[PDB]
Amino acid sequence: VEVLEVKTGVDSITEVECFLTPEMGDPDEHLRGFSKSISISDTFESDSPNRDMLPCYSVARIPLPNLILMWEAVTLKTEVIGVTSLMNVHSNGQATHDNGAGKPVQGTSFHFFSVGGEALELQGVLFNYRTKYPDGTIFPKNATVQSQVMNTEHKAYLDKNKAYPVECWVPDPTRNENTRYFGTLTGGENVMPVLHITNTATTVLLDEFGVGPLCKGDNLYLSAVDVCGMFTNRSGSQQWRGLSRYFKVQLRKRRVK
Amino acid sequence: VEVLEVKTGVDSITEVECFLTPEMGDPDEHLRGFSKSISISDTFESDSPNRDMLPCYSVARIPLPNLNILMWEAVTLKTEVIGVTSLMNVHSNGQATHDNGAGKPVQGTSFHFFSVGGEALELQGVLFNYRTKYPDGTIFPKNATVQSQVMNTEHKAYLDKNKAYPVECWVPDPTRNENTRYFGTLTGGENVMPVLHITNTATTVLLDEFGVGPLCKGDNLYLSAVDVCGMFTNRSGSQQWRGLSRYFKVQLRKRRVK
Amino acid sequence: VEVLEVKTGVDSITEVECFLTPEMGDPDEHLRGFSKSISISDTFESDSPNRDMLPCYSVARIPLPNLNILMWEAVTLKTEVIGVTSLMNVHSNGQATHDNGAGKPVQGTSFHFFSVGGEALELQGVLFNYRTKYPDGTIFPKNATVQSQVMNTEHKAYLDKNKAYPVECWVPDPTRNENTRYFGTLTGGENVMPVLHITNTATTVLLDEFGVGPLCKGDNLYLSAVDVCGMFTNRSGSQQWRGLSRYFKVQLRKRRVKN
Amino acid sequence: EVLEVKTGVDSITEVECFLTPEMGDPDEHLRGFSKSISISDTFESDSPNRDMLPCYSVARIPLPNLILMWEAVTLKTEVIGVTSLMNVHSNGQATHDNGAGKPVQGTSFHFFSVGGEALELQGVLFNYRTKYPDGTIFPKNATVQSQVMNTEHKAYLDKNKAYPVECWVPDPTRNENTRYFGTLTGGENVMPVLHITNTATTVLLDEFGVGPLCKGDNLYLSAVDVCGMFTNRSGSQQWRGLSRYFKVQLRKRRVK
Amino acid sequence: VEVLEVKTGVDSITEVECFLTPEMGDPDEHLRGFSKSISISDTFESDSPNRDMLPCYSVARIPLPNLNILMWEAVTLKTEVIGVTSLMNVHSNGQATHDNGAGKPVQGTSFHFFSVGGEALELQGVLFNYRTKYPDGTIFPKNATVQSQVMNTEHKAYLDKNKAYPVECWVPDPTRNENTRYFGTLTGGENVMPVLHITNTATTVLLDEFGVGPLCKGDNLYLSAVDVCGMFTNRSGSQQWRGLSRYFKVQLRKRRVK
């Protein structure tokens, strides 16, 4: 595809606005947004997490006005939704010390988002190649010990919700030319969430040549992970807590050959 | 709808200067700026916080000089937290850091937030625990379901009353608020250390990318804030939220609209 | 006051250079730059700190060359905390980090603050606990009510005397101070770690958005500071505030004004 | 003498690859991990096993055969598999009773370099009496001065799984034809902060607009990404490393 | 000194490149780069540190090609700490973090400092404790009084000797050093985690706001550094300072002066 001129006029722009809910495991009917309590295996060889203990990537495919012209994603506004809910320290939490308030959600986090004109492309990497991933997840197949550092057989598309576990997959930096992605892993038991919200911040999606993601088939792909940390209940057991993510994307019509 | 030119001349500008006090719960007549001590439910199902244990959003609606079409447009903001040094009182019924130590300072989870708009801040409800029973005298997300733990679009509100909207169940609705500029930071964790900056040399510009600030409908300016600074730990170890007031200085100019 | 042109030439400019020593409480003749050990009250109603336990704002009023209308305009500031490496003394009566370890260094809650103005820094009172009884020899919010814990507009003052205005009672009043530029950071918590930078290559510009700095009424420059670096913990576990001096260098120029 | 840049569609090329970490690989299942760390009784008796010592990674990448030289102009790079560190259910020591496993945390070193020849190294030893093991390349004739600076300890990063991270740093007195960047974050309580994006580029050009020039049409990439330590249920700790992605843009440059 | 034009031509520039080794106390023949283990006095009065427990400032006087009038002018600096990876040795008689764990790395209070000037760094004495009794072989503030704990202007000195001036009682004098550029950071706390960046792509410009860098008196360039990285804790729990060398590359040009 050669990239030619942007179309102008009143009908040459459009806006997509939506939210992506987190997929943390949802271990029962009251615990949407949470994972199952985490259990620890006795040995590397016996690691076999249940499905409801594994946070997964979220993805949405948004149809665009039907249009060679293609919609070009130019700017993004994005925000984690419900940051203040993490101030509930009065609900079945373990106390920080005798007579203290409950521990807030804290510890290891992953905040990630992407915007593309096609599915986010994934590369599989495993903490422990002998981990037995559960049915209903899509995970790196034919794992070897090299899968612990880099096995290039582990290629996938983020093309399904509640399916691709966060811990097995990262964006593939060798692909994804038609996607812009951003993530931060902050690891450690003592990690303290720092969540900013504002309606004044914009990310520009144009590459160095001034071209944004081009939406194949008139579809925009949004992807997210917002694992905010772990919630600790009274017994000390811990579970992941996630939050929804807002996306506002501006697009314009671009001609290509 | 259609924004035209800015008016010039000495009479074309005005300023609003004020402070918003915090509403942390005020459990008795000596404890303004504090919540009630925090307790913990045995289960999610039994979570029923007291009114005086829940910090709320602060709001002020400020009448501007009558114009009539012209509208006041908010252009700049200076803001700061008032009384940061009071958190150096570590000798007033605090729990000692260790044997013979000084009192622990206010610390832990904090939320700092302010907004400026030409109409009420628009809110979206999100709950940590949908079975939380919110108390009488608060305005909270109604008909809560388990989906309210992540996103339930039913939960819409306006920040149009003080001591009413609990912080923990409401956030600025990013799908609305076209005519408002908002800024917030949640810093979460038991070991969070307050970092509070003060200066009179910093200004935030409120213009959007087309150079247009909030436009004040009916000649009203809306200021909103939350400054939960952390928790104060008393000698027994029980903890209560501590908040501080926020100063606002807004410059506005007349703008013609159709 | 209408502000007009800047004067130029050899002696259109002058420089002020000095240090402000900290006023931490100075509980005996060997403890300059420290407070008294902190003790904790049993209740809010019984909080009555002794004077030597309360750090105070430092201030100097520096007379400038008589001009008369012209006024001296404060244009740039260089500033630096003096003696930062003194805090590496971990061998002097401190409490060991663990068995056989070095002494704990000064750490924990800090307030670093400085201001330059053409008149006294203007203060607003805010109290952690309105029932606190402040001691004789200090200037503190009077007629305190429960509203003083958040905002009571009665508590207005000028930083016009040393060893007098306790840091915990007073902040710069953001509703005033048009003729002062102030800057401050409170970093609170037991686990706060001091981060102190020094360099002679950094300059802060004092001009406002119109290109006008502080204008020195009666030819006086007002410098104010607090540098509570944290707390020193001695062998017994008791803790006391430790502060350091602050260097100021201000360039000023002559400015013509009307009225 | 460096002269003009060549233009035309044949004048640019691109190198893209991953460097795997070399953490020690103590058994056939533990690629990316070191052996459990044990501690010597004295400085004099410090003698770590090979599989306990992370090493620098390096790849020499051949370029299209070309006086013209390939000039390295820009770099995109990130750590690959950052999310794998969210596995807190695999034989980890629990944070507290009934809690999740501790994540990888503690001392980290993240390092990358791009050059037109092998990275040049200077040796510095924590403890000069450390006996380094067979199969590593380490500062020879160590003296007590080697603990601060002994200029005899010079080497080229010209072999994988060989140069231990703790012995060697880039020689700042050399490396005129390499650009290097590294951060050591030290302490038991260090928490990994790992950013990924395909939108960030590092420019490799010096202050005269000249990037690394590839001698013999070879590009040298080097890395260390020791992310911290994993603690298993017994409390013993091993280094965990991750791979690093490199994409380098290059252009043809004439030289005399 | 009125400063005139810069010379040009091939011969008008020169470069100084070297390493300054740290002076941490070197308590025995095997422990170069370390201090003696730290012990604590029972009173301020009895504070008597041994010489080998006291890190000192490092300095090098580098003679430059003889010029005469012309002076060498220091224009740019590359600098970095050498050996940052040695701090990953957590297997050498360190105290375990916990049962069966690795040894604690170097951590805690640090001071990183460097300066370039055309004459000795000028120093001001400040004392944590004015009654500290500094040892023979060190150069320390004389006639200390209680005012020395905050500012006593009698305590002036030149950094004109190696392993002599202890770090803890001297800082750069901000009322002087017109002809030097200095940069330092103290990061204090038992829980300080060292963050050490290395790169050969960073340059510090030494020119002042008038475009004039340090002018080298008698054709001598003065380099100074302190890099106390933290403390090493051995198995017994005793702790000692650990330092590293610093690289300096300075570009200088000939400048005419009257």
User: What DSSP assignment string belongs to D29-73?
Assistant: T-TTB------BSSSTT----GGGS-B-EEEEEE-----EEEEEE
Residues in chain B with CB shorter than 8 Å from the CB of C42 are 93, 235
A177: Cβ–Cβ under 8 A, 6 or more apart, which residues?
none
Diameter of chain E measured on Cα atoms? 69
Token readout for C83 is: 């003696």
CB A83 within 8 A of CB B110: no
Which helix (H) or strand (E) segment holds residue C70: the answer is strand C70-82
Q: Regarding the domain delimited by D1-256, which CATH topology (the fold level of the hierarchy) does it fall under?
A: Polyomavirus Vp1; Chain A (2.60.175)
Which helix (H) or strand (E) segment holds residue C259: the answer is none
What is the spatial distance between Cα A179 and Cα A181, in angstroms, rounded to a whole number? 6
Token readout for A243 is: 């939050």
Residue A216: phi and psi, rounded to 5, are: -65, 140
Torsion angle (degrees, nearest 10) of CA B213, C205, B114, A80: 90
Elucidation technique: X-ray
Measured between CA atoms, how close is B100 to chain A, in angstroms? 19
| Helix%, strand%, coil% for chain A, nearest 5 | 5, 40, 50
| Helix%, strand%, coil% for chain D, nearest 5 | 10, 40, 50
Measured between CB atoms, which of D32, D191, D201 is closest to A188? D191
What is the spatial distance between Cα E229 and Cα E109, in angstroms, rounded to a whole number? 8
Q: B19 - beta bridge partners?
A: B247
Cβ burial of C10 (10 Å; 0-12, 13-18, 19+) is exposed
CB B243 within 8 A of CB B82: no
* Touching, D vs C (3+ Cβ pairs under 8 A): no
What is the spatial distance between Cα B183 and Cα B178, in angstroms, rounded to a whole number? 14
Residues in chain B with CB shorter than 8 Å from the CB of A100 are 38, 233, 237-239
Resolution in A: 2.1
Q: D74 - beta bridge partners?
A: D203, D249
Provide the 3-class DSSP secondary structure of residue B146. helix
Residues in chain D with CB shorter than 8 Å from the CB of A55 are 86
E183 touches chain C (CB under 8 A): yes
Measured between CB atoms, which of E93, E96, E191 is closest to D189? E191
Task: Say if the Cβ atoms of E146 and C102 lie within 8 Å.
Answer: no
Chains touching A (at least 3 CB pairs under 8 A) are B, D
DSSP letter for E238, please: -
Residue D82: phi and psi, rounded to 5, are: -60, -30
Q: C89 - beta bridge partners?
A: none
CB E211 within 8 A of CB E76: no
Token readout for D238 is: 């091993």
What is the spatial distance between Cα B89 and Cα D253, in angstroms, rounded to a whole number? 66
Establish how many alpha carbons lie within 13 A of residue A189's alpha carbon, considering only the half-sphere containing its beta carbon.
18
How many Cβ atoms from other residues are within 10 Å of residue C145's Cβ?
12
Query: Cα dist. C196→C228, D244, E126, E183 in Å?
Result: 12, 35, 15, 11
B158: Cβ–Cβ under 8 A, 6 or more apart, which residues?
B120, B121, B122, B123
What is the spatial distance between Cα C103 and Cα E38, in angstroms, rounded to a whole number? 8
- Closest CA relative to residue B189, chosen from E130, C13, A188: A188
What is the spatial distance between Cα B193 and Cα C188, in angstroms, rounded to a whole number? 5
Chain-centre distance for alpha carbon C244:
11
**D:58-97 residues touching chain A, CB 8 A cutoff:** 76, 78, 80-92, 94-97
Measured between CB atoms, which of A85, A90, A229 is closest to B41? A90
Task: Say if the Cβ atoms of E150 and C193 lie within 8 Å.
Answer: no
- Token match 């207005």: residue? C156
Measured between CB atoms, which of C84, C92, C192 is closest to E41? C92
Domain ranges of chain C: 1-259
What is the spatial distance between Cα C99 and Cα C108, in angstroms, rounded to a whole number? 21
What is the spatial distance between Cα B141 and Cα B134, in angstroms, rounded to a whole number? 9
Token readout for B94 is: 């605090």
- Closest CA relative to residue A200, chosen from B117, B206, B59: B206
What is the spatial distance between Cα E225 and Cα E116, in angstroms, rounded to a whole number? 9
* Touching, A vs C (3+ Cβ pairs under 8 A): no
Which helix (H) or strand (E) segment holds residue C172: the answer is strand C170-172
What is the spatial distance between Cα E163 and Cα E51, in angstroms, rounded to a whole number? 9
- Closest CA relative to residue A85, chosen from B2, B54, E230, C115: B54
Establish how many alpha carbons lie within 13 A of residue B137's alpha carbon, considering only the half-sphere containing its beta carbon.
11
Task: Say if the Cβ atoms of B181 and A199 lie within 8 Å.
Answer: yes
Q: Regarding the domain delimited by B1-258, which CATH topology (the fold level of the hierarchy) does it fall under?
A: Polyomavirus Vp1; Chain A (2.60.175)
Query: Does CATH number 3.40.50.300 belong to domain C1-259?
Result: no
Measured between CB atoms, which of B19, B92, B243 is closest to C129? B92
Residue in chain A nearest D15 by alpha carbon: A174
How many Cβ atoms from other residues are within 10 Å of residue E37's Cβ?
21
Torsion angle (degrees, nearest 10) of CA C124, C128, C132, C137: -40
Cβ burial of B153 (10 Å; 0-12, 13-18, 19+) is exposed
What is the spatial distance between Cα A240 and Cα D89, in angstroms, rounded to a whole number? 12
CB C44 within 8 A of CB B93: yes
Residue D9: phi and psi, rounded to 5, are: -65, -25
- Closest CA relative to residue A117, chosen from A189, A219, A187, A191: A219
Token readout for B98 is: 């260790």
DSSP letter for D189, please: T
Chain-centre distance for alpha carbon E177:
15
Angle at alpha carbon of residue C80, lines to C74 and C84, rounded to 5°: 165
- Token match 């100074």: residue? E224
Q: Regarding the domain delimited by A1-257, which CATH topology (the fold level of the hierarchy) does it fall under?
A: Polyomavirus Vp1; Chain A (2.60.175)
Torsion angle (degrees, nearest 10) of CA D175, D180, D186, D191: -170
- Closest CA relative to residue E228, chosen from E138, E106, E123, E141: E106
